[PDB]
Amino acid sequence: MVKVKFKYKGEEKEVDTSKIKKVWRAGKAVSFTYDDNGKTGRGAVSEKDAPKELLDMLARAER
């Protein structure tokens, strides 16, 4: 139940931790994919502006 507020192509968008599928570490940036209902959607934020639940998802991913 963590909410992520991000800018996609200059448009403010927002998606919850649960809907999140993929997370990659790209320099200072966090690059990710979610399930917007049937479809998949793309987004990114700065590691600085990221919520804790997310950062934990990332650590998990590096095994």
Side-chain angles (χ1 to χ4, degrees), residues 1-7 10-23 25-38 41-63:
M1 170 31 52
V2 181
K3 152 192 304 219
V4 178
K5 327 194 160 177
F6 64 106
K7 203 143 157 179
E11 164 194 358
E12 282 303 343
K13 294 199 171 131
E14 176 273 319
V15 67
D16 191 281
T17 286
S18 63
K19 315 179 255 208
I20 299 176
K21 331 206 289 219
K22 310 273 233 159
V23 69
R25 185 161 239 127
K28 301 150 318 214
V30 184
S31 174
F32 63 84
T33 82
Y34 61 97
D35 185 82
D36 46 4
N37 228 54
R42 286 172 145 296
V45 314
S46 88
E47 163 266 337
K48 284 179 327 195
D49 317 328
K52 173 187 189 289
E53 167 78 338
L54 187 69
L55 292 162
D56 287 355
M57 302 177 60
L58 182 40
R60 286 172 216 145
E62 301 170 302
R63 293 83 34 83

